[PDB]
Design a protein around this motif. Structure first.
Motif, PDB file in Angstrom:
ATOM      1  N   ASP A   1       0.796  -1.736  -0.138  1.00 47.15           N
ATOM      2  CA  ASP A   1       0.462  -0.502   0.062  1.00 47.15           C
ATOM      3  C   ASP A   1       1.106   1.304   0.396  1.00 47.15           C
ATOM      4  O   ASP A   1       2.639   1.010  -0.334  1.00 47.15           O
ATOM      5  CB  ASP A   1      -1.338   0.178   0.672  1.00 47.15           C
ATOM      6  CG  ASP A   1      -0.840  -0.013   2.418  1.00 47.15           C
ATOM      7  OD1 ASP A   1       0.556   0.539   2.615  1.00 47.15           O
ATOM      8  OD2 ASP A   1      -1.494   0.283   4.008  1.00 47.15           O
TER       9      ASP A   1
ATOM     10  N   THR B   1       1.096   3.169   2.693  1.00 47.22           N
ATOM     11  CA  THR B   1       2.321   3.189   3.222  1.00 47.22           C
ATOM     12  C   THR B   1       4.111   2.525   3.453  1.00 47.22           C
ATOM     13  O   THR B   1       4.945   3.366   3.702  1.00 47.22           O
ATOM     14  CB  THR B   1       1.694   2.959   4.915  1.00 47.22           C
ATOM     15  OG1 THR B   1       0.396   3.560   4.667  1.00 47.22           O
ATOM     16  CG2 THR B   1       2.427   2.894   5.854  1.00 47.22           C
TER      17      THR B   1
ATOM     18  N   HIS C   1       7.837   7.567   6.248  1.00 49.97           N
ATOM     19  CA  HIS C   1       7.203   7.118   7.557  1.00 49.97           C
ATOM     20  C   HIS C   1       7.745   6.005   8.070  1.00 49.97           C
ATOM     21  O   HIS C   1       8.505   5.241   7.002  1.00 49.97           O
ATOM     22  CB  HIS C   1       5.686   6.676   6.964  1.00 49.97           C
ATOM     23  CG  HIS C   1       5.071   6.345   8.302  1.00 49.97           C
ATOM     24  ND1 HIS C   1       4.738   6.850   9.548  1.00 49.97           N
ATOM     25  CD2 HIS C   1       4.471   5.251   8.469  1.00 49.97           C
ATOM     26  CE1 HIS C   1       4.027   6.505  10.006  1.00 49.97           C
ATOM     27  NE2 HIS C   1       3.858   5.564   9.733  1.00 49.97           N
TER      28      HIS C   1
ATOM     29  N   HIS D   1       2.374  -5.274   5.529  1.00 48.81           N
ATOM     30  CA  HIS D   1       1.958  -5.667   7.354  1.00 48.81           C
ATOM     31  C   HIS D   1       1.133  -5.843   6.513  1.00 48.81           C
ATOM     32  O   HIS D   1      -0.591  -6.338   7.090  1.00 48.81           O
ATOM     33  CB  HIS D   1       2.135  -4.053   7.763  1.00 48.81           C
ATOM     34  CG  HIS D   1       1.100  -2.751   6.625  1.00 48.81           C
ATOM     35  ND1 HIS D   1       2.013  -2.315   5.072  1.00 48.81           N
ATOM     36  CD2 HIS D   1       0.053  -2.508   6.918  1.00 48.81           C
ATOM     37  CE1 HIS D   1       1.251  -1.439   5.062  1.00 48.81           C
ATOM     38  NE2 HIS D   1       0.186  -1.573   5.467  1.00 48.81           N
TER      39      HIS D   1
ATOM     40  N   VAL E   1      -0.980  -6.052  13.290  1.00 49.76           N
ATOM     41  CA  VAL E   1       0.110  -5.367  12.415  1.00 49.76           C
ATOM     42  C   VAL E   1       1.190  -5.255  13.795  1.00 49.76           C
ATOM     43  O   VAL E   1       2.433  -4.671  13.762  1.00 49.76           O
ATOM     44  CB  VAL E   1       0.109  -4.573  11.887  1.00 49.76           C
ATOM     45  CG1 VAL E   1       1.323  -2.905  11.401  1.00 49.76           C
ATOM     46  CG2 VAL E   1      -0.959  -4.923  10.851  1.00 49.76           C
TER      47      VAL E   1
ATOM     48  N   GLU F   1       4.853  -1.442  14.853  1.00 45.53           N
ATOM     49  CA  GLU F   1       3.890  -2.234  13.291  1.00 45.53           C
ATOM     50  C   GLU F   1       5.499  -2.355  12.629  1.00 45.53           C
ATOM     51  O   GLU F   1       6.120  -2.200  12.220  1.00 45.53           O
ATOM     52  CB  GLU F   1       3.701  -0.709  12.767  1.00 45.53           C
ATOM     53  CG  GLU F   1       2.391  -0.334  13.681  1.00 45.53           C
ATOM     54  CD  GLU F   1       1.858   1.013  13.081  1.00 45.53           C
ATOM     55  OE1 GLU F   1       2.419   1.516  12.518  1.00 45.53           O
ATOM     56  OE2 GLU F   1       0.700   1.442  12.907  1.00 45.53           O
TER      57      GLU F   1
ATOM     58  N   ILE G   1       6.892  -1.865   9.382  1.00 43.75           N
ATOM     59  CA  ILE G   1       6.658  -0.630   9.198  1.00 43.75           C
ATOM     60  C   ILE G   1       7.725   0.835   9.786  1.00 43.75           C
ATOM     61  O   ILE G   1       8.044   1.854   9.970  1.00 43.75           O
ATOM     62  CB  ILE G   1       5.354  -0.270   9.104  1.00 43.75           C
ATOM     63  CG1 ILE G   1       4.203  -0.703   8.343  1.00 43.75           C
ATOM     64  CG2 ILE G   1       5.095   1.703   9.477  1.00 43.75           C
ATOM     65  CD1 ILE G   1       2.414  -0.286   8.742  1.00 43.75           C
TER      66      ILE G   1
ATOM     67  N   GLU H   1      -6.645  -6.384   6.241  1.00 44.24           N
ATOM     68  CA  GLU H   1      -6.008  -5.460   6.813  1.00 44.24           C
ATOM     69  C   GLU H   1      -6.174  -4.134   6.550  1.00 44.24           C
ATOM     70  O   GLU H   1      -7.068  -3.732   7.474  1.00 44.24           O
ATOM     71  CB  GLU H   1      -4.542  -5.744   7.076  1.00 44.24           C
ATOM     72  CG  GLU H   1      -3.406  -4.937   8.166  1.00 44.24           C
ATOM     73  CD  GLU H   1      -3.291  -3.546   7.646  1.00 44.24           C
ATOM     74  OE1 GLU H   1      -4.182  -3.595   6.289  1.00 44.24           O
ATOM     75  OE2 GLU H   1      -3.250  -3.285   8.780  1.00 44.24           O
TER      76      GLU H   1
ATOM     77  N   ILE I   1      -8.992  -1.307   8.894  1.00 38.22           N
ATOM     78  CA  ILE I   1      -8.245  -0.075   8.688  1.00 38.22           C
ATOM     79  C   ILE I   1     -10.188   0.899   8.615  1.00 38.22           C
ATOM     80  O   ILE I   1     -10.268   1.621   9.957  1.00 38.22           O
ATOM     81  CB  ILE I   1      -7.506   0.499   7.526  1.00 38.22           C
ATOM     82  CG1 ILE I   1      -6.158   0.522   8.090  1.00 38.22           C
ATOM     83  CG2 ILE I   1      -7.446   2.288   8.264  1.00 38.22           C
ATOM     84  CD1 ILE I   1      -5.663   0.129   9.498  1.00 38.22           C
TER      85      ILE I   1
ATOM     86  N   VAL J   1      -6.180   5.274  13.536  1.00 38.10           N
ATOM     87  CA  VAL J   1      -4.720   4.089  13.010  1.00 38.10           C
ATOM     88  C   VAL J   1      -4.861   3.530  12.720  1.00 38.10           C
ATOM     89  O   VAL J   1      -5.754   2.905  14.150  1.00 38.10           O
ATOM     90  CB  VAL J   1      -3.766   5.463  13.696  1.00 38.10           C
ATOM     91  CG1 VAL J   1      -3.508   5.205  14.857  1.00 38.10           C
ATOM     92  CG2 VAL J   1      -2.161   4.900  12.754  1.00 38.10           C
ATOM     93  N   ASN J   2      -4.606   2.195  12.848  1.00 39.26           N
ATOM     94  CA  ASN J   2      -4.086   0.988  13.322  1.00 39.26           C
ATOM     95  C   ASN J   2      -5.780  -0.069  12.644  1.00 39.26           C
ATOM     96  O   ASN J   2      -6.816   0.666  12.494  1.00 39.26           O
ATOM     97  CB  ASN J   2      -3.295   0.486  14.351  1.00 39.26           C
ATOM     98  CG  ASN J   2      -3.216  -0.727  14.442  1.00 39.26           C
ATOM     99  OD1 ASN J   2      -3.496  -0.637  15.095  1.00 39.26           O
ATOM    100  ND2 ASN J   2      -1.980  -0.881  13.054  1.00 39.26           N
TER     101      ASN J   2
HETATM  102  O1  LIG Z   1       1.403   3.435  10.414  1.00 38.81           O
HETATM  103  C1  LIG Z   1       0.213   3.698   9.978  1.00 38.81           C
HETATM  104  C2  LIG Z   1      -0.063   2.418   9.635  1.00 38.81           C
HETATM  105  O2  LIG Z   1      -0.333   2.452   8.104  1.00 38.81           O
HETATM  106  C3  LIG Z   1      -1.046   1.298   7.942  1.00 38.81           C
HETATM  107  O3  LIG Z   1      -0.768   1.184   6.616  1.00 38.81           O
HETATM  108  C4  LIG Z   1      -0.905   0.007   8.599  1.00 38.81           C
HETATM  109  O4  LIG Z   1      -2.169  -0.666   7.844  1.00 38.81           O
HETATM  110  C5  LIG Z   1      -1.512   0.034   9.665  1.00 38.81           C
HETATM  111  O5  LIG Z   1      -1.403  -0.698  10.663  1.00 38.81           O
HETATM  112  C6  LIG Z   1      -0.809   1.012  10.005  1.00 38.81           C
HETATM  113  O6  LIG Z   1      -1.044   2.095  11.977  1.00 38.81           O
END
Ligand SMILES: OC[C@H]1O[C@@H](O)[C@H](O)[C@@H](O)[C@@H]1O
Ligand SMILES: NC(=O)c1ccc[n+]([C@@H]2O[C@H](COP(=O)([O-])OP(=O)(O)OC[C@H]3O[C@@H](n4cnc5c(N)ncnc54)[C@H](OP(=O)(O)O)[C@@H]3O)[C@@H](O)[C@H]2O)c1
Ligand SMILES: NC(=O)c1ccc[n+]([C@@H]2O[C@H](COP(=O)([O-])OP(=O)(O)OC[C@H]3O[C@@H](n4cnc5c(N)ncnc54)[C@H](OP(=O)(O)O)[C@@H]3O)[C@@H](O)[C@H]2O)c1
Ligand SMILES: OC[C@H]1O[C@@H](O)[C@H](O)[C@@H](O)[C@@H]1O
Ligand SMILES: [Zn+2]
Ligand SMILES: [Zn+2]
Lengths: 357, 357
Positions: free
Chosen positions: A38, A40, A49, A63, A87, A114, A117, A150, A154, A302-303
């Motif tokens: 994705d 992120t 990030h 993730h 996550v 995470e 991430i 997932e 969200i 978030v999350n």
């Molecule tokens: O990092 C912030 C968020 O990014 C998203 O892509 C993830 O799906 C979440 O689990 C995460 O909390």
């Protein structure tokens, strides 16, 4: 085993080799099937990030994962169960109240890792382990697109909090506006079409020229495509209508502020975007006046956690089959993993396939 | 009868003479006891908020009132009942869904009148009428300070909506920060001291030099006075602590935006101020990032309805007696009505007395 990682200083994902992990007590060993990519993830690769695990030269990415349990160890899971991992995991210091009360999705900065991430390796490896409490069983027939659970989760969380904010009065919305035509925005648009609140008019903001496959998806869902280059968020009520519900999935901070002007009285905006730094001159008076005099709310989210993943399995079943086919533009074998990280206009949702059931 | 009004083009309140009204079916006749004055009234006199009734050369002021029923007419009220009127009434066009579903406090611009504020005469007259459904009976012993029930009810509503926004998870706040040291801010501070949520640390923002009676009230309630000239809202977490709950009662739009930086993770800000126009350069990225990554909320609230007035009668009983004495700096007979509209630093809450029980 093979894993897909970003290395310190390096700029692109590469394959590395690592030992197969061994589950500790309370953990299962899972063989990875597919892992999604994705916006992120792209930000993680670029350094905007997240962050590396302490004392490691690399971060295994990914993730959004689905896998099959190959060793249940001493857990109540069974061999062959299809599972999606959550996550968030406790940080180095250990557990805290957010994890103890089963709400790690509410933990602040520095009180969680995470996976894929921040501070912990992700799921783009042939195998991974996790505690049973963070593995959600899903129906076997959802295995092929199980990496979608997932991101659906969200939105399940964001809607729970946004709707809670409107629960002290009789709120009956008819219009919803999704900001952003990425994989999160498009999934959310489809979810809103089947939402129990009964939205009559759906809208989605993007900035693409036709022909474009994201525009096609928006219109095929019977929503209206709004081009932000033609009609900025603050002007939407004049051209279209005031929106009862807004869901922000652009990561553009101007949208967080301007959404208040597009909201109908008594409406709520849910903010999901992970923003870049940005400063501009705002009519703060207009923001303030609209919030107060028209009983508006803004909620950030978030999350997500286990209950949201469970809810996602139900929502999945309600989504149109054509939509799931059009959203997922490429599932790539590990041999062609690089293709999953293309980010052109015609690439929507991608995934990497590590193995099959 | 005598009434206190502002006239078109004119700048100060004056006494006018008007006929005693006669109740229609479903209405009671009430003899006014006392009517409070707040910051919104001053803004109405100055032309910054509200508006005159259609085809009238004047607006009778006052929206915080207590009275005694002198003619119950065909209602279920009784002669001698002590009542406080609600503020909102249907507009000229007639009823709408907000009034029909008993939530006129959620009605948007143009779908309500507010007595003493917009489109309808207020309560600073010797007598007034209202429908029974908009008259709230209060305990007889609250008659002398019964004009406080309305502003208490404002906060009862704001807390209901702010708390609803946090109801999807286990939220346990310990710190609250009230922005503003006017009559609404000070009342709210006292209410937070007795709130069931159990706040341990209370703070209140103002901009006064000692000696000052608002500072004395804040400190006597065991709260910390924060001088915004020394410590702006965004700097408060560095000097003091992050705040779980913020209540904005300044009408200063910078506070609406900067509150997000002072909020603790998972916190909520309630916005009540009626703002002036104002523009400035905001770090929109910081606003956006804090909302999302730390699950924050901002909720605006205006007006209130019957259930909030009822709740206010309970909250009233819990407030310290010294506090009620210190808050109300002058109750003025009609003969000296002008004094109620003084706005120096040593004037906190005033009221005009039309009659006694
Ligand atoms: O990092 C912030 C968020 O990014 C998203 O892509 C993830 O799906 C979440 O689990 C995460 O909390
Ligand atoms: N809060 C959470 O738990 C969470 C979870 C998942 C994702 N996220 C975040 O949510 C956002 C959406 O995720 P995603 O995977 O869908 O990301 P994405 O693929 O980057 O999608 C973002 C979309 O927004 C569009 N956009 C950006 N600026 C725009 C503008 N000014 N006008 C109109 N459209 C604009 C982009 O269009 P173009 O392609 O034309 O530039 C892009 O398609 C990201 O910020 C992501 O990091 C947060
Ligand atoms: N939403 C609703 O239903 C509703 C209901 C009632 C009232 N209101 C509004 O809520 C606000 C509060 O009402 P009120 O009767 O308490 O009004 P008020 O008497 O005018 O009180 C406002 C206070 O805020 C202080 N203030 C202004 N700017 C400040 C700053 N930059 N730093 C620190 N303090 C500052 C002022 O202090 P100084 O005296 O030193 O200038 C003043 O004492 C007003 O805007 C009012 O119109 C709304
Ligand atoms: O006009 C906005 C608000 O001003 C306040 O002073 C009144 O107490 C409220 O009833 C009103 O809704
Ligand atoms: Zn994601
Ligand atoms: Zn008022």
């Amino acid at each position: 085993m093979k894993a897909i990682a970003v290395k310190r200083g390096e700029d692109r994902p590469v394959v590395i080799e690592k030992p197969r992990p061994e589950p500790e007590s309370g953990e299962a060993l899972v063989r990875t099937l597919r892992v999604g990519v994705d916006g992120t993830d792209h930000e993680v690769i670029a350094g905007g990030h997240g962050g590396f695990p302490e004392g490691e030269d690399h971060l295994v990415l990914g993730h959004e994962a689905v896998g099959v349990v190959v060793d249940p160890n001493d857990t109540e899971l069974e061999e062959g169960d299809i599972v999606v991992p959550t996550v968030r995991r406790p940080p180095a210091s250990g557990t805290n109240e957010y994890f103890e009360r089963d709400q790690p999705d509410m933990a602040p900065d520095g009180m969680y890792f995470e996976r894929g991430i921040v501070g912990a390796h992700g799921y783009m490896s042939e195998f991974f382990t996790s505690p049973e409490k963070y593995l959600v069983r899903i129906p076997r027939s959802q295995a092929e697109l199980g990496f979608l659970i997932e991101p659906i989760s969200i939105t399940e969380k964001a809607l729970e909090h946004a709707y809670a904010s409107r629960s002290a009065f009789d709120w009956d919305p008819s219009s919803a506006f999704v900001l952003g035509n990425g994989s999160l925005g498009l999934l959310t648009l489809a979810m809103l079409k089947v939402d129990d609140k009964g939205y009559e008019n759906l809208y989605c903001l993007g900035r693409r020229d036709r022909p474009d496959p994201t525009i096609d998806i928006i219109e095929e869902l019977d929503a209206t495509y709004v081009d932000s280059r033609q009609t900025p968020v603050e002007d939407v009520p004049d051209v279209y209508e005031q929106m009862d519900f807004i869901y922000e999935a652009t990561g553009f901070p101007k949208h967080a502020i301007q959404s208040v002007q597009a909201l109908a009285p008594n409406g709520v905006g849910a903010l999901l975007g992970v923003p870049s730094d940005w400063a501009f001159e705002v009519d703060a008076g207009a923001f303030h006046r609209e919030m107060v005099l028209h009983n508006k709310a803004l909620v950030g989210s978030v999350n997500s956690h286990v209950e949201h993943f469970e809810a996602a399995t139900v929502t999945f079943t309600k989504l149109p089959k054509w939509f799931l086919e059009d959203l997922v533009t490429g599932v790539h074998p590990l041999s062609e993993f690089e293709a999953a990280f293309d980010d052109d206009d015609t690439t929507i949702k991608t995934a990497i396939e590590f193995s099959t059931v």
